[PDB]
Design a binder for this molecule. Sequence first.
Ligand SMILES: CC(C)=CCC/C(C)=C/CC/C(C)=C/CC/C(C)=C/CC/C(C)=C\CC/C(C)=C\CC/C(C)=C\CC/C(C)=C/CC/C(C)=C/COP(=O)(O)O[C@@H]1OC[C@H](N)[C@H](O)[C@H]1O
Lengths: 635, 244, 244
Amino acid sequence: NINQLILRNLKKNLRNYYLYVFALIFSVALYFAFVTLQYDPAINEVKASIKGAAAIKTASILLVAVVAIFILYANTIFIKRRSKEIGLFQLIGMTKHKIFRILSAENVMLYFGSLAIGVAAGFSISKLVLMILFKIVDVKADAKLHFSEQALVQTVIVFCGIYLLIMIMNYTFIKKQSILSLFKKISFFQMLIGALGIVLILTGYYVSSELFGGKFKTINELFVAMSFILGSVIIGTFLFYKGSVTFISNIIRKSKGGYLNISEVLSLSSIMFRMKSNALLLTIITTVSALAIGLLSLAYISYYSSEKTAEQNVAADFSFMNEKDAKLFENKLRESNISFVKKATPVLQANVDIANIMDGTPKEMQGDPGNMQLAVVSDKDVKGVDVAAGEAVFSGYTDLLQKIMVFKDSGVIKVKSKHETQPLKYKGLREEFLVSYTFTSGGMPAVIVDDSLFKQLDKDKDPRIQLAQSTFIGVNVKHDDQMEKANELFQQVNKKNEHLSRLDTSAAQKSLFGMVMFIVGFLGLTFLITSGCILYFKQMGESEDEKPSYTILRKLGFTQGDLIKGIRIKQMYNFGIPLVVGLFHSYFAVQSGWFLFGSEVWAPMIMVMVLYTALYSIFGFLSVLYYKKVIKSSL
Amino acid sequence: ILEANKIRKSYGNKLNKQEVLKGIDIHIEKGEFVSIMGASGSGKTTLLNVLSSIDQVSHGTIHINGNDMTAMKEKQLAEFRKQHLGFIFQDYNLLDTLTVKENILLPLSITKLSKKEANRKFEEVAKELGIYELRDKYPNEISGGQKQRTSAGRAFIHDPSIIFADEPTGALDSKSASDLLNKLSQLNQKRNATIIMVTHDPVAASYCGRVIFIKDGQMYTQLNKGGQDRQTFFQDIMKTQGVL
Amino acid sequence: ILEANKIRKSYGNKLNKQEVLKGIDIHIEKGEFVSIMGASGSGKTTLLNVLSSIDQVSHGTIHINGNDMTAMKEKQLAEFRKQHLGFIFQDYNLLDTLTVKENILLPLSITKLSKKEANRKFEEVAKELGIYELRDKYPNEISGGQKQRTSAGRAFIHDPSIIFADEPTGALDSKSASDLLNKLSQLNQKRNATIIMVTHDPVAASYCGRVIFIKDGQMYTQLNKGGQDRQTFFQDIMKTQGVL
Ligand SMILES: CC(C)=CCC/C(C)=C/CC/C(C)=C/CC/C(C)=C/CC/C(C)=C\CC/C(C)=C\CC/C(C)=C\CC/C(C)=C/CC/C(C)=C/COP(=O)(O)O[C@@H]1OC[C@H](N)[C@H](O)[C@H]1O
């Protein structure tokens, strides 16, 4: 008789909880794929700055730290829902050992029958993960791989170790169970709680707005401000659920008086008394979702703007530091049938005073305003502008600089020469770049003076701040051709790799940020699935705890087709409030961190949030699909 | 309004048939207070259930305000049941998370009358019953008869054609039941609204104008009262029940 | 059957100690329907735990069929409770994945009993309670009243004598509660069994004959009925409860 009961319980549990099995299979497959990827000797072709074989080692630990927490938490609701089932057995008369055996004989099957499918599905995804990684980064081809038995051993060990914790928790719950265990107006403290919940979030956003380019600038001071913001935005979010949605709901309710409708009764009866109870799980979900979305968007901004940052760093397609290597390169190119447009431009490093052109504070200095290092070039070299005497024109854009080094209008600029000072005035700012980042210090634009003025500036040549090479030998290229062979020739030219190329600088950044893209994307998809499953499981109690309200509404004249709409518009708010809060957090976190990872934004942010919402709506749909069943059986 | 013509129902569970309704002829005009009573295992409850739209029919024809109901569609039947035929139940059937005003004004949400006409009509309906003081008290602090009175007020909001009462005074003391019956009589005399009640208490049938003594699906005639004193009619009903 | 003398329960979690029960004098004979009324905050659950031997007693003497509860150990207490006690709960706590026949017969199959007499007992119980038609159905297609009757039938598969019962009419409407109370009423006129009932709504207690009130332990008096007509008795209970 026991076997029939166990089989029936297993069949019943395989139907109510299937997302649990799906999550188990997905997690096992991903962990096996990551371990196989790490231990395989084939990822050696992907390297930009980090080794890669160690990044996967770190990414294979956070996944376990998330999956184990998910399992150990979601396997508590299951044992709590069996509360009014052990008392009946105790009344009938059974030793606790028999009850423990009955409970475990089902979990053993339901766990191992999924663990034996998760591992067997790792083969189909092992090659696809390599394909995705090799498509994000640039690499030639080919992937063969083998069994990698170490991955099987590690996965089996970990997912058998978790089961012992599950079993000890279940045994502790069974022993702790009681002998049988079978038999409002608004306050004023919540006023203060609701006020604080919004005030803290708003002030955190406002402070985070002026983090960069603000009144405070010190490596030992921005840490404190960051900690204060990251504490405020969390305390406010926590207080937003435990005593701040009740205020808004009460204000909404005390705005219609009497006449209402079934579209609002369920929401105004359930949201206030249910969101308060769970005001620690929702905080964690919102914070982790915001943290994943922000990191993904911040990585994708850099991946998008790498191709322009590389072109901005070096003015031409090739840069050189010595004449010997430049002439060797052109001699090699001579018989390669690839004609080059080579132009040279000397640079005279000099310093001036830009104190009067500051719109902000001396704190935003990045160098002494009166003795800041700059670069000076003549006017005959430039083929776009023809300046005159007593005129200085800037160049470049440097979107980061405009947010920090704000420039005023025309004024007086003092030349800090050896024993003279010729004053000029600021004409304007160009957009193109003329000198590579080697000769222009960090990011300071170079100045352009008149040819006549340069005729004495080069004669002076104050030898105190002059660089090793006061020349900009750079070999450009013709119209579009095979630049790959040109890059190969350039690479074989510099054995000591002491020069600069556009393609290499672009590819390095692309690979380095693509690795983080892949890791964070997979580690965020796993958490999305986990959070959706947890929320769907938590939504199951409301169905069984609200039946003696549907059974009364249906006896007043209402039909199922009229209750289903109210259920839909209640589930909309229930599944949408945390998502909206997380989106707001992510948006106000990204907006304080751009203009530093590169160039364009509003391209990746929407492209990430749209995908996140599209992958998040599924569990919201499934919750309504479940509510339909209990609605149909209410009568 | 009501017109029952040989409405009959057979109880069948695919293996046994035990008919309980054999021959019904009810003539009800607009604006009376009739009652159905008799025995304890008869078909009076089934008669009330089949007269309304809460239960289907087997053999008979029923016409309410000229409309056809015996062969009428299910969705249209639900629409008609929502539009008319207010109901008073044996139990309270009151939602706990709302208040009195919402509880008795919710069934008016389907037909949108804005936030002016409904608020004007609620005061008129609730002041006749004397529950205007109970406008924001939740239905867990008020007494017993006030919940039934709020249910009656909910049933009296949308001005229905026929009101079916299934044992209103079932779990109330004498004073509350008498007050509720007097208020129902006053509401009947104020606005023309037919009320049908099924009760086991002779005092409840005393306030009525006509009473039908059902007997295992038969007629056994009926009383008429009319120009008769309340107490004398009470003893007449007591004698008629004693005959049974 | 049972005798309650100075029934007291102890407490004392951390500092505060609660003396909910301060001695009771309950004398109940064999084969009668007894109901214990009260009010919220009277600790009726603690009283049920003390009398049902689920919670270990602290003071006073309780005798079950002439045997003191404390005279046996824990395992012997469980065996005696299984042999001579049943239970009826407010909820419908049942095995969803078990049929009605198996759910009723589950407590009986443990003690090494042959199938023939078990089937005979199930037949007798189902015929007495009139639920034999749902012999091979499931609890997922059965109304609340039939589920409660199935639970009650399970409570009588091995004949108790001091069977307890919490409020059965907590999640039931009027008709189902009336039917269940009626069935329990004719079940009392059969083989004697104490059916101590701890409901608080006077409608449920109207079918009793030994209504007992609790304010501190017995401050209010008690009613005996005997010759009343189940309506004057109910009115008397309502009035004397309204006195409080
Ligand atoms: C996840 C994790 C690890 C930690 C958790 C905390 C954290 C940091 C989270 C990330 C943020 C998210 C998404 C949190 C989600 C959660 C919440 C609650 C959001 C809302 C909070 C809220 C409302 C506001 C708080 C916002 C904050 C705290 C930061 C945003 C600004 C940000 C992204 C970075 C600033 C901090 C640093 C160190 C920058 C330095 C980065 C860097 C490459 C430096 C190198 O120099 P740099 O100059 O940049 O690069 C080259 O340098 C050499 C060359 N010569 C050139 O100079 C140049 O090319």
